[PDB]
Amino acid sequence: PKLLYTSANFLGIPTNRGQPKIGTYQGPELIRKSNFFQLVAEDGIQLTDCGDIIPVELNEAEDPQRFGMKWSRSFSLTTLRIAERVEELMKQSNKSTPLVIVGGDHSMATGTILGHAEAKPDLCVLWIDAHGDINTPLNSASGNMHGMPLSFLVKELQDQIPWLDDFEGIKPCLNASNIAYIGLRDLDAHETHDIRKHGIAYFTMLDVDRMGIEAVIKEALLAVNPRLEKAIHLSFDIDALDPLVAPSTGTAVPGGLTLREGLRICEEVSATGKLSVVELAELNPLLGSQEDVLKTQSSAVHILRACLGHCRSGHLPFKVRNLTDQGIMSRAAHMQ
């Protein structure tokens, strides 16, 4: 049996200061508690747990609202700490060794992409989400950083980002043409404006309905990675999936991707051989019932396994088993 990726790194980022609901910090543990590692090993992949990044969580006095943003300095400091760690992991592995990141609220993506791009400047981004996460600070109704992580990364948007000194090291490292969305269904008006104005490829649930997920995936890859020349940063918000399948998340929106559609995205991205980083955001084990958490954990594990190359059509055994070798009489042998 052949593998596109024989080894992989696992990294937890328990961000929770990007949105007000406590519990996203438990995301990484939700996956470590699962059978994820075991299942990955059974497919013949060597998965190294690289631990957790410690987010910077300032107190209220140190981090007051600035431009309506909540916890903006905890964000800039966390973003830089994340970027350093991801960069160093990606360069140590510069076949290929994918980095699997479990969050944590989606505000971590500013840091993960920043670091990733430092090691791989020509990357593209596939953003799987019910939301755009591209609100610029003055347009955000909530001030929640998890709704803004792309806005700081996109060059074309920098005239709508307020300057802050502590954000200086957060260099916009993405062109609008390097990003493609899949799964959108709850865009804010100003996000819609920016996405259309700057030509960001986007495939909403309407598109998934009309085109089918197979054509959507194909068109998304065509738009930002036409010849599979670029490393892929796959940023997967669990809330992209339907609430029936991933209820334990802070901003659930009805009419999402089926688990199967989610699997198809990850299977195809994996199969390009260009999956460089996959991050899974917005797991919150403190939301919903016990069964809700189990469903969400289960969905997340299947998604992540798909990213690493798990095939639903089965895998071949590494060693084929033979009855005769154990000194055992078969039915065929007995009849002969």
Next chain:
Amino acid sequence: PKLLYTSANFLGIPTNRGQPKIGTYQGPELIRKSNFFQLVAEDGIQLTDCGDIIPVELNEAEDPQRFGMKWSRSFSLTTLRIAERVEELMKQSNKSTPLVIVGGDHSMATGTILGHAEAKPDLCVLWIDAHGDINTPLNSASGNMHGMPLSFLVKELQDQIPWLDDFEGIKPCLNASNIAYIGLRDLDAHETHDIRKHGIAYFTMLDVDRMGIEAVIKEALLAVNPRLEKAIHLSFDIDALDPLVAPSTGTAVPGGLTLREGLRICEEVSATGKLSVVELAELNPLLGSQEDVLKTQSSAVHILRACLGHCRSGHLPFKVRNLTDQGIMSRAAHMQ
């Protein structure tokens, strides 16, 4: 941003005498308690709450069984009261101003369509339901009026409707060729007979499975509104949707439309520019768990928003926001 419909009317009809399970009278309140109105406003639509129609609910002595029908005189009197109110609302608005009606059990449709047709005689009807709701009184196993509302409206069926004096003012205002069903999966044998005999266009879940919802919608519109010349009466039974998505309803049937399929129907109907009335029937907040009710409410709100023109691919802002106008330094400006 442009809108097909800039204003709309909202009307509650808390019918509950069309079926035995208490709670459909709470349907209108379930939607008023939601964020429906707020969400409609945020899309730039002016929605006027026109209140509730008071159904006529006679006592047992005044309204005994007649031809097996339960509460048939409460029905005829309610039907006429509804018809008057809907007619007057539709004529006051004779662009275009859609009427959104929340029930209430589906027996209200005899009245809503009667009134609608008085103002718009050439209308067509799109009936989205797991059921035919076209049982004639002697064929009904239950005697529940919510299973008969179309039978009194269809001209071709009048030789199978028993005459009752109090039904005189309920004039059959529909031809069989003006109706198309989507979502059917639990037809009674005599409904199947009448539907096929009189050539009523129907697309069951089997058809949805084999054709896909996109082709079904297209064929349904082709059958009853080929050139978008006619006003559309969209009669949406919440039980058309799968029980996983709308559990809180009295006659739930497995294997229904996904929410997305339901949204596609409403999105396409809305986009014709001919949506004249949409009614949503059979919400029952007294059925199922608290979470069941929330799921059902949520599904209903998304469906109704789609009918009014909400786009899952986003809307443009009415006023585009500019950093410089507030006297704020952007990152781009700072770097220059």
Next chain:
Amino acid sequence: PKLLYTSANFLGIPTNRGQPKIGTYQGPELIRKSNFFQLVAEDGIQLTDCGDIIPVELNEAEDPQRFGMKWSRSFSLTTLRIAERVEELMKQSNKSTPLVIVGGDHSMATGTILGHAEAKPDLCVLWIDAHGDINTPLNSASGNMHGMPLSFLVKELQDQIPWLDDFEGIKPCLNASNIAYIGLRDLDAHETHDIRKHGIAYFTMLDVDRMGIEAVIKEALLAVNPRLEKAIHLSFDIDALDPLVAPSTGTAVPGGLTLREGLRICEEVSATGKLSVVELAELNPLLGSQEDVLKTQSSAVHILRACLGHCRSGHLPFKVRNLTDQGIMSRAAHMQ
């Protein structure tokens, strides 16, 4: 109204020694307690309840592990008892009279197919399951017989089956070319090996996603029954369906068939006119909540009804009802 099958037999097989979770023995009762029989009758089908097969359940001392298998002698003895009963039922009915079997864990299939093939040697098998159920004894991680029932039946696999005297009467009666799988998503590596090596037709959830269920069904029938010449043994594991739709089963796997996809398989198999036996395995009413059991029961009933020829597009009445015959005045007659 015409019927492909006017009569049918119903048989319970409460196997529970094929897997460790208590409750599959309650499967047959779960269906008898439903409205299944009534619904089948209302479609005009004569369904005869033929009772239950009593499985042989030895004690621990009489049935120790052999080749890692758990309860292997209870299995061989049960297999032979089942085979005798099914053979005798199929020969008594040698139009056509389908046998409907409700389990019981899937280990019963070795017996049902053995008996079926005795009466109909040229049969084909459609295996609807999340799992291959084709583990050979030394490759099974669990030793659970419900994961091995096909391995004893497939001729090409007999050099990997250990000989046991009490298994002598279990004659391999299937060629690898007579079997087609639909719904696979959790194959063990050695199953994948055997399936590919011996050319067993298989359509996994990946295939369902990429091809659509319509093409999958067509290709599955083409592979093992190209000209509808052969009797069909439809072996339906309830766990083939998504856990959202059939939670009450022992080895549930996310991302399964929708109920509608399951219905389409059974509808098409039924419509060939070659449905000879359908068995439904792995119902376990002792698993999950009360609502979970109700959902699972409901899904099972709809599936079974589809197998017997129930049409979601409706059925014609046997006697058409006429208003005038009862001495009743119609609205049409009154107006004339």
